[PDB]
Ligand binder design. Structure first.
Ligand SMILES: C/C(=N\CC(=O)O)C(=O)[C@H](O)COP(=O)(O)OP(=O)(O)OC[C@H]1O[C@@H](n2cnc3c(N)ncnc32)[C@H](O)[C@@H]1O
Ligand SMILES: C/C(=N\CC(=O)O)C(=O)[C@H](O)COP(=O)(O)OP(=O)(O)OC[C@H]1O[C@@H](n2cnc3c(N)ncnc32)[C@H](O)[C@@H]1O
Ligand SMILES: C/C(=N\CC(=O)O)C(=O)[C@H](O)COP(=O)(O)OP(=O)(O)OC[C@H]1O[C@@H](n2cnc3c(N)ncnc32)[C@H](O)[C@@H]1O
Ligand SMILES: C/C(=N\CC(=O)O)C(=O)[C@H](O)COP(=O)(O)OP(=O)(O)OC[C@H]1O[C@@H](n2cnc3c(N)ncnc32)[C@H](O)[C@@H]1O
Ligand SMILES: C/C(=N\CC(=O)O)C(=O)[C@H](O)COP(=O)(O)OP(=O)(O)OC[C@H]1O[C@@H](n2cnc3c(N)ncnc32)[C@H](O)[C@@H]1O
Ligand SMILES: C/C(=N\CC(=O)O)C(=O)[C@H](O)COP(=O)(O)OP(=O)(O)OC[C@H]1O[C@@H](n2cnc3c(N)ncnc32)[C@H](O)[C@@H]1O
Ligand SMILES: [Fe+3]
Ligand SMILES: [Fe+3]
Ligand SMILES: [Fe+3]
Ligand SMILES: [Fe+3]
Ligand SMILES: [Fe+3]
Ligand SMILES: [Fe+3]
Lengths: 261, 262, 258, 262, 261, 262
């Protein structure tokens, strides 16, 4: 009736066509938090080929838990309009403050992002970042990837190499991909200074306005996004308001779409 | 421009409301894996007040990773119609076998269940049931819940309690809730031995057949579905095919739905 | 200032030694400074018995600090309400029969009166075993085998010291650590079945009924009593925790007047 | 008779209102040791609204254990008068040296501080400050809080934010709050340098001297008390003598109470 | 000059043809210790299709370290003739006692086994064992496999299913595959009793003679081998003499080859 | 039939002999990865007394798992001839690119190196060098070795010492031996900074080119090869292509071989 082997063969064949397929993508996003997912949504909407490389088996990052396990997220008016196209239900709590359910937003955003074409590879840690000289200087043009698993158990397993036109570090507070660039290649970042400055303490107002503005190309071929943008640029954090996180992924997507012409 | 205080007010206030309004529910489901989520969808879609208590911050259980991190999940025709009530796109590989992306399927089923009214509490462990004499019967009457971090770190933190009319143990392989029921209370389960028998080795054809059959009331007030059904009744596991797990959830919600219109 | 480091060290050492040596023989040795153990030690010391409490944590209070799920509130019903009044714990009637208390104020106030009342606390100290001596023709618990908690955690080859008591109180909570041990290592029999799932009404009746001398010389109090007399727990209602501690203290004080 | 869902809802309701009514506070104390509790008592005595955020499930910091598990604390004359304001029994060892039972000192100070209105939240780590440019000046205006377990287990759970007119670092040797303030802001503190200098070795005379003197506003909006003050300003540690910790706490409360009438 | 992607594509394509290939093997050996490797050698020599599933990234099991890190192994006369076809150098220490270098024997055995055709999948834990009814009763006819990694980090990752005509539990002291059969299916083993009896304390003489004799089909479709044979049958261990381990893998191979007709 | 005593005698006696006869060697190689093994082969094949000290019980380094547990290793034409001195079978995938099974290649290279006379000590950490003044020069003169379990468990166990005429740091990415050389002794290495520079991000064409170039003497008496060469000199890593690593080992053995016929 039901062959164990057709099933293994099917799982094996599909994943590995899928991974051969994305050995070249236009945009490789690192981190499947909100900003990573929203960026990959819009880029997959505009038709580009988008891979998302997520350290944990699940996507969603720090949105699942809300604040202190109280799984309600807040967005202001900027980002409320992003809860709209993904279709996230929200009611108004006070003028300019829109509550949503943390689980609903995360799964709906993530479902629409993968349905738009963005491939997800979960369990995969972006380890380092391919940089070569292409007509002139050093340019980031790919990712070094391994199983998260391998990383933390400290196993001598060699990585695989994904190549891309643009990398988005949507990796959260730790900004680990641009940190790793910065540290291993010795370069300078477009941050003034030329380093991962480290995120400043909390101020919701300045914090979110800066997240949108910090979402830029800090080195040729690599964009920060979401909370890595505030870590890289040395701006304030904003607590559990997620409007700036969603907005950031949209900004990095349309801007990368702009250069992709 | 923004009051950090207002964001904090709104989160504390909202979650407080969500928790209070589910201290008494029709159906408390334990575990947001494939089968637990589908049961919550259909139970909500039929208009019942449902809460889901999930140990990890992210729902989806063993289904994120397809098999061996190879992001694909196979279903056969049985769960292939379940994949259409949710809008999970798929292709077939060979006749009768279907492939969906594991992440799309997990998040899509997840989204539509919580949109139907399934209220998800993540980072919450169900650690015991409420066991209480009804008309001359011990009956599972609800759950004893704590934060997962309290169990993990062995912190002396007392749990809270919710009441439900039915509890669904959908905790996977662990069969976690019924296992606790049997040892702390010395009751018997509707199984060959009276106990959680434990799953047998792999046989995909019998395993998927026995999952919908074992998804049943095993003691007054509590169902098992999913891998927990096979683990409780002593049937074969099936491997990375998810048609049983999805069908399991629909079957249990319909049976509990019927029982609720007595 | 003129603070001799030598004098501060000598004081701390001299005082603790003499406190420690003066409780090598106590009337009642209580294991566990959670709610029942502290309340039992208050009521016994207020009656003028030498009570020693042995708490594995550096802090007392056990599981009362967190209320439920870190939500710092204690709910007490009829019985525990009037014990709160014995200790001076403020409260507030949510609905008739239910009284809310600050979980931190209850713990620290109960702890404070218990130790002011004469009950001596030894924190950081794990009761590891009991002393079984034959007395009057039967085996009987006659005190404790104690070590540093930190020797148990890091698995260190360090011997215990021995406390002598007329009665021992296992107020260890869900673990029923002392009677489980006695039972496991002697091949005795008690009156440890393990607790049952939650039924808070039988749970708070069953905690006071079950706080009894389950083997010569050793009472069980509080949650330890329910786990031993395999009954139902109760959740974040603390009334029977407070009442059983007073109950055990009355029983023990009565048997000690003979 | 005993309805567990009435119990559950009273706890969920009181606590989450206790938390909302301290999203706004006059003074947020981080650290429920002897210094942080004493400042909390004297501020609450004077009627100001006070929250104390405590990392462990219990308060008491390092006073529980005396020195080397020997449960005795030594105070001199300056601690001696503070023990009498609390009703802590003591005995005189050699002239000008008083020893109290360390369990009695910790639980009594704690009890009276909380009876006077100091609200305490356990299992809650202050992990960062709110920094706001107030009239052209960067000022500490609150705390970023999370559950302790979330930091231990490295969970991706966002914080809640409270707001305060004054923050007291009373985190003992670690000087946790002012330490993260400096490295993440890059600011400078009222010392010779910035950040925390780190404590010197031991010299009880100078160590106790300097605790009283270093309990200061080291940056607008945040004070340091107790050993965080010695650590921040780089003075000597005193041994297991707690006179300076208690007096440190009382100084910071009277100083902050002054500034709260301006 | 040198494309990062042809390299990833090559590693991806080859492994996954290789794993599609062995979704059916004649014999799936669990454990790449000496007995597992010697069995797969001879079965691959006789032309059968042999997969080896090894929990650790390296093969060799407990042979690498010799005894107490003193990396010299001993074989008696039985097994000396097995050091011959693999070509392991050995000098005679005393009549009937042949020393070999632990690293040399392990790598040479393992190289000749993989060169004979035995495929190795390392990092792969055999988790459970497919049993179905095939004309009559329950028969072991495959393996449930996952990444070792997954197992120990306790990650909810589903396994894959390999199907085979015969399974060899060459898994060492722990006999984990037949233990897992025995415990999950409730069956009885051909051991008298019907359980993993557990290995007896040490006696070199009886221990090694029993290893050869205990290497049998303890349940339809599954063979023990090497040190799992002594664990399953309740016989003595033999210390760091490895002659019986090598002999056992040969016996299980020619006997399984016999039934494969 | 058998004397357990005789087996134990023969193991203790044999290993004792093997250890003693290598307390003084021509070349002590640290690390039995791809590049370390190939260098030991060619150095033995040319008749020099070689010892290899490998931290783990199994040689082979990062090469067992090909890439991401996908058991295949790519080499280009450069290491494609190296694969023939050992008899590692391969196919080509696209022109100039070759695939060998990672397990066959690892064990085959390993077998032939130890058969050529390379004596392998596994479970042994090189933790320091011997540094000793020769004709008016500090020169690496040998190694300080301990059991890996002593380092892992932080046991107070003193090491032993071997002497060699050349030490080859082939410890992969860690560049473990030269890193210790630089910090404990304050020497400089033949590199841009004088220090272990650290590897740069990935560039497979330059990475493999720079590996044979950086496989050189970096301080009197010690070479680097393999990934340690790239890590010490600050070049690009290359990913899962092993032609540099094999060529690296042959180059270093030839250079050390020449230097040894001064
Ligand atoms: C608003 C806020 N903080 C404000 C405040 O604290 O005041 C938050 O914390 C938000 O969650 C931040 O949103 P954002 O999308 O920027 O990040 P996230 O949710 O933390 O997602 C990051 C993702 O990136 C993953 N990740 C990490 N590092 C790697 C790696 N090398 N390779 C692959 N993935 C990696 C990681 O698993 C995670 O899922
Ligand atoms: C097909 C298959 N196996 C076949 C095979 O192996 O051969 C699978 O693994 C499927 O994923 C099984 O799906 P199913 O929905 O039955 O279970 P799951 O995916 O493992 O999810 C169960 C959920 O329950 C959670 N959970 C556990 N215990 C508790 C607890 N006390 N309280 C709250 N939640 C808990 C747990 O985190 C998990 O998320
Ligand atoms: C009502 C309720 N639960 C209902 C429910 O969950 O459904 C509770 O949990 C209450 O907090 C229980 O109150 P109770 O006083 O019975 O127990 P507790 O708070 O856990 O205190 C036990 C004390 O005993 C300590 N302890 C443990 N074992 C030893 C040992 N061998 N030696 C010395 N001390 C030990 C331990 O650290 C602790 O302080
Ligand atoms: C006299 C002496 N030392 C002298 C010497 O060693 O020679 C002492 O140890 C005294 O006990 C010092 O008393 P003091 O009140 O200054 O500090 P403490 O007892 O150590 O308590 C600080 C409290 O602060 C808590 N805490 C820490 N960090 C955080 C954080 N980020 N957030 C929330 N709470 C936190 C922490 O759990 C602790 O309870
Ligand atoms: C002679 C002796 N002892 C005598 C004495 O002590 O007196 C020995 O220890 C010999 O090494 C035994 O040789 P043998 O080939 O029988 O076993 P081994 O060397 O221990 O190899 C077992 C292999 O099996 C592996 N393994 C384990 N369990 C699993 C699993 N579920 N799935 C996949 N692989 C697994 C494991 O990694 C290992 O490599
Ligand atoms: C191609 C590639 N990377 C490219 C990329 O990532 O992009 C690789 O990983 C290759 O495997 C590198 O081969 P190479 O022979 O250079 O190094 P390796 O395989 O990692 O082996 C080094 C050996 O050295 C061992 N070792 C470490 N440190 C010590 C120590 N102090 N003492 C004794 N041995 C030690 C260690 O166990 C290991 O076995
Ligand atoms: Fe590498
Ligand atoms: Fe409890
Ligand atoms: Fe002893
Ligand atoms: Fe955050
Ligand atoms: Fe499963
Ligand atoms: Fe030394």
């Amino acid at each position: 009736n039901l062959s164990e082997v057709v099933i293994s063969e099917a799982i094996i064949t599909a994943f590995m066509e899928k991974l051969k397929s994305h050995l070249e993508t236009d945009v490789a996003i690192v981190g499947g938090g909100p900003s990573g997912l929203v960026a990959g949504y819009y880029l997959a909407k505009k038709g580009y080929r988008v891979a998302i490389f997520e350290r944990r088996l699940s996507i969603g990052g720090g949105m699942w838990a809300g604040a202190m396990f109280f799984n309600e997220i807040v967005v202001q008016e900027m980002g409320r309009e992003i809860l709209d196209e993904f279709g996230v239900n929200y009611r108004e709590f006070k003028p300019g403050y829109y509550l949503a359910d943390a689980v609903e937003a995360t799964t709906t955003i993530a479902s629409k992002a993968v349905k738009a074409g963005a491939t997800v590879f979960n369990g995969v840690t972006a380890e380092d970042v391919v940089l070569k000289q292409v007509n002139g200087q050093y340019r980031v043009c790919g990712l070094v990837i391994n199983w998260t698993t391998v990383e933390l158990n400290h196993l001598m397993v060699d990585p695989l190499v994904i190549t891309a036109k643009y990398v988005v570090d949507a990796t959260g507070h730790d900004a680990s991909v641009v940190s790793t660039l910065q540290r291993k290649a010795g370069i300078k970042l477009n941050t003034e200074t030329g380093c991962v400055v480290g995120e400043k303490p909390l101020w919701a107002s300045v914090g979110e306005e800066d997240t949108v503005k910090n979402s830029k190309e800090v080195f040729p071929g690599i964009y920060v996004s979401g909370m890595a943008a505030n870590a890289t640029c040395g701006s304030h954090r904003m607590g559990p308001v997620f409007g700036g996180m969603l907005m950031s992924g949209k900004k990095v997507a349309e801007e990368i779409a702009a250069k992709l012409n």
